[PDB]
């Protein structure tokens, strides 16, 4: 009964289970949006238990974000492992996952768990040639992981959750170590987090998304971000490529993963957004690598 449903998904040991709220979750909780545009504070300990860190064995580097959905399965962006134009083509043995982390650089003794990958499953139809369509990969751990106060799975959405939550005006939440900030000409100061960060962004209407990029946007993608303007606290660019985009159901109080951080736009000063893979549309793919896979 792996990711074919998971009972405890999205109820966080330190918040929901103790009837405790994080310092910003009410924002997700409006229905209307106009208003609290929170900046991108540091995460609270246990605020995001499903957060994963893809780690390059050697040279030891933080490759991307990822999310815990089972005790044996991790979800990321396929571009994190396979991207011909950049000679990117990772294998099982080239990475490790790191679950249970806050600090970006410390090994976190007695908290994090580092595991090996057994197999990587890229969607057969992911499109690196043009726009990164079907940017989803699944990694099955080399051995199951024990949930902790710090380590817990997020829920995968179902038809109705996707239907009611995925909507223009509704805030979602990204978390990550800011690997979406992969500059050159930059002089990244007041940055490169020490600790995991968090920001709540509003989902954007399809046409407004299409009309801000030159990229051909498909049905498998959504965009979120505040309106390039005067006061726009919160940046998409604040996450990690392959990391999680999540909403808290107002019906059942659980946390589901609605998107995977795909690319960001005008990640500099020009008012663009973040693009994410639409988890609900790719879900039957997921449904079956799992329901029928492992090695």
């Amino acid at each position: 009964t792996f990711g074919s449903g998971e009972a405890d998904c999205g109820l966080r040991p330190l918040f929901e289970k103790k009837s405790l709220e994080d310092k910003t979750e009410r924002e997700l909780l409006e229905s209307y949006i106009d208003g609290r545009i929170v900046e991108g504070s540091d995460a609270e300990i246990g605020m995001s238990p499903w957060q994963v860190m893809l780690f390059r064995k050697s040279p030891q580097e933080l490759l991307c974000g990822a999310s815990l959905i089972s005790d044996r399965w991790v979800l990321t962006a396929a571009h994190c492992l396979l991207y011909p134009p950049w000679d990117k083509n990772f294998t099982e043995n080239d990475l490790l996952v790191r679950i249970g982390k806050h600090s970006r650089t410390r090994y976190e003794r007695n908290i994090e768990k580092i595991s090996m990958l057994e197999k990587i499953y890229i969607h057969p139809r992911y499109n690196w040639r043009e726009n990164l369509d079907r940017d989803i990969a699944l990694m099955k751990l080399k051995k199951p992981v024990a949930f902790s106060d710090y380590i817990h799975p997020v829920c995968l959405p179902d038809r109705e959750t996707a239907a009611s939550l995925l909507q223009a005006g509704y805030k979602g939440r990204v978390t990550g170590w800011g690997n979406l900030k992969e500059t050159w000409t930059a002089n990244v100061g007041k940055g490169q987090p020490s600790v995991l960060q968090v920001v709540n962004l509003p989902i954007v209407e399809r046409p407004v998304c299409k009309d801000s990029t030159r990229i051909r946007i498909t049905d498998n993608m959504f965009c979120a971000g505040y309106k390039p303007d005067e006061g726009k606290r919160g940046d998409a660019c604040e996450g990690d490529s392959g990391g999680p985009f999540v909403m808290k159901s107002p019906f059942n109080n659980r946390w589901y993963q609605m998107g995977i951080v795909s690319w960001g736009e005008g990640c500099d000063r020009d008012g663009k957004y973040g693009f994410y893979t639409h988890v609900f549309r790719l879900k039957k793919w997921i449904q079956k690598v799992i329901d029928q896979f492992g090695e």
């Binding site: 064995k57 030891q60 580097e61 490790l96 970006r104 650089t105 410390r106 090994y107 580092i114 090996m116």
Partner: peptide
């Protein structure tokens, strides 16, 4: 920046 992780994970 990355602190070294146990030789046991490679």
């Amino acid at each position: 920046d990355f602190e070294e992780i146990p030789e046991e994970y490679l």
